[model samples]
Target chain A: MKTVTVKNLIIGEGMPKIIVSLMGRDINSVKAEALAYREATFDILEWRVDHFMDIASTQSVLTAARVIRDAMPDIPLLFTFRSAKEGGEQTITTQHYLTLNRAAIDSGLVDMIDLELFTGDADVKATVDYAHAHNVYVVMSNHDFHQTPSAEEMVSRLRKMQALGADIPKIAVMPQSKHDVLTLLTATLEMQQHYADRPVITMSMAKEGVISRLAGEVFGSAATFGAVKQASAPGQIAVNDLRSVLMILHNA
Target chain B: MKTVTVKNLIIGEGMPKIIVSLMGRDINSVKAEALAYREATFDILEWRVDHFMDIASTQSVLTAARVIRDAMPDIPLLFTFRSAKEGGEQTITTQHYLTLNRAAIDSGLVDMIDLELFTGDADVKATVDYAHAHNVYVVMSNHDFHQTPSAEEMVSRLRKMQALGADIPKIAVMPQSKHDVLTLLTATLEMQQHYADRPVITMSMAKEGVISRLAGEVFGSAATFGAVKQASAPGQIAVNDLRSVLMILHNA
Candidate 1:
């Protein structure tokens, strides 16, 4: 399988990298969280622009991204504007969404970008294309808060993401039963071993699906998301605990 | 959930119990293993009597059981004579198998007994009946070293053991891929939540299945096997590491 490199950290080898989400709503809060993140252990820092209180001002959003980049310049920065329809705190018009991401890509403050996979075929492809041209990697993603899809459909979706010029294809699904977690993991293993040409990230959400989060290396996911002070997603393990468990599974 | 109490250790509550296997060939080796087991932390000690060289002599077998009981008197002792068909070291005729298990049950030195599920319906039921009459719990087991069966079929097997009066119905299968491991875990959840009135133990053999072994609490399994100096089964985590990981998942 192919690996994605952001700065010097390789994405598809050895232990799965830990990512901590920054869930701040203002410039002051964003800067404070970013400064605090430097003391935590993680491979990547994701800025949830959708959580920003002043997202209406493009300059304000750009300023926050720049502050994060200034505080932790060594680690990879991922810019994300998760829409309310996809379990995020806020929503934006599709045109504004496309423009905001394009500006982040052009600013060159963020090392990577997160584009929702269902954000219209033409728009997603254009944003992904822009990211590549500006030397920024695209982490194409999807989320299902209710339940996981069948293994075949999940694999097909991930494969489609890869075909749409995604450097990393990602998915997260909430499981209602333990068997649904298996479906997510089964899809991950099948995608990694059979179809994936590049590294892919997959997770089954919540306490019932924490096994999928912890056993990524064994089951073929390339990265996992954890919480620092606040979590952007449900059932996110604490960063330190997530790192400890990852090492335990790695050594075992 | 129904819990079986062997001495003071309740088998179905709190964290999954850890049972380390003692694989030895002679009285000296068995005695030494038992002595070392005193320093190890585990809820139960499973004596794989099939590894002993003298199954023909009932007195020698009883002597080893007495030594183990004398060494670790507080912890539970489970006597197992895994036939060659079930990935064990030695082979025994059906009559010999029945006689050997009966002798161990009658010795009053063991707290529990492992009667293989496929050892004929009448024989298994008879041995289970004898074990209960002696106040020894029966951990009726089946092992498929080849590959995992379907989730439905595996649940059916565990339920069958329950019907045959097994105090704890256990099954272990070898996994060919990550999906097979999920299948084992799925079967475990199904049996524990829907069918099992008593605690059930399920595992997928080898490294790929280690997640199923460690995530038993979330998936509804009652216990996991660990190794001391040597592992009696494939992918058995070391006692120290297994205990540490179990605690990590427990607190998580």
Candidate 2:
């Protein structure tokens, strides 16, 4: 209903929000990716720290966050060190995931952090609560890579996240049929129109579901993600291509 | 508000919407671009048919549409040969523009046809009415490439299109600032929430304005566009990246 600020960016209420993905396993690749994503005219940058090596050491992630912050002082940065169970490329022990999230937040470079909703661990909730205490926005996320759920199930999942103290509720599903994508979009519209308190985002993945990315705005998604070159996940669009299509619809 | 049928594929209301852009000055190029755009998973391909050469000849224009339809047997295509006065690339005379639109619609390949709102000539409106008689959906479009207007102005514009018997009232604007993008998104949400009866598609263009593309989903936009290698306009995301981001938010 209104624009929300994730650090420097004001997403929703129609503010142009661009969250560029930064991926790579090493410090140099991370930094380069950060710079490139920033130059792609993104409003915010997200570090898929899940892809980084040596993340077992909090200092490594903290250092990378600090360096990225120094390089792009004006733009807001989000840190996400995805867990092994959550479809991230890197595998981290539960203890390491918590530690890395804390370290990234402590660095003060990350304006927001992504936490998986199905961690099903008490410590995961504690970490989210801690991030909230530190003025960090927690985006509670669920990824159903296998199949899309019904509209009612998607709404329930989002409501669960909102009730659990998440600042935002986001859901992604890999659709097997056109019917699956339809269910996801319908749920998004229903949530934005009635249920959502913060913001509810819904999308269907894979090539068949790419339309959900652009069409999500109609369903009430707060922000959409684009990759500079290497995608953080499957079905990611290039930043330039995303910008071009957005312009046509905007200017049309 | 509901699903849009594109031959066999249906978009909107949770179904995946396919948006494709065609670019070329000659019939061969236009035909090639149409095939490529369709092959890129686009269910609804759009032709800036004004970009094609010899649009003055109705026979040639119909031939081109026939070729495109032959190439993309499965994809439902939308045709628009806009005049320069209507925010399109063509610099053709008004008579030529009207003739081309009619010829394309009569070619039996087009599922939807675009009629620029500003081209208010009786012949243009007649062509739209005729297209409707042929069971082709008519999209009444307003393109403001210069600036974003106030919410009230946007509402009036959309209302005008509906009154003019447009199957869809489509509006686009260029966002000069962050606030500009917000204004467009707000207008879209407000319009869809109140005035919109048929599906309404709204977007903001340019690098600074892409937020409207993603945000349009939350605002209740019916469809949005994307690109693969080349963009039909400014600020489009690639299909791959767009899908990935949408998936993340949907599951979040």
Query: Model 2 misses residue A47 by how many Å?
Result: 0.5
The model with the greatest TM-score is 1
**C-alpha local distance difference test of each model:** 0.89, 0.72
Determine which window of 10 residues in candidate 1 chain B has minimal summed lDDT.
B243-252
Highest lDDT model number: 1
Q: Write down the worst ten-residue block by lDDT for model 2 chain A.
A: A243-252
Model 2, residue A93: distance off in Å is: 2.2
Q: After superposition, how far is residue B51 of candidate 1 from its true place, in Å?
A: 1.9
> What is candidate 1's TM-score against the reference?
0.95
Which number leads on DockQ?
1
Candidate 1 residue pairs in backbone clash:
none
TM-scores for candidates 1 onward, in order: 0.95, 0.54
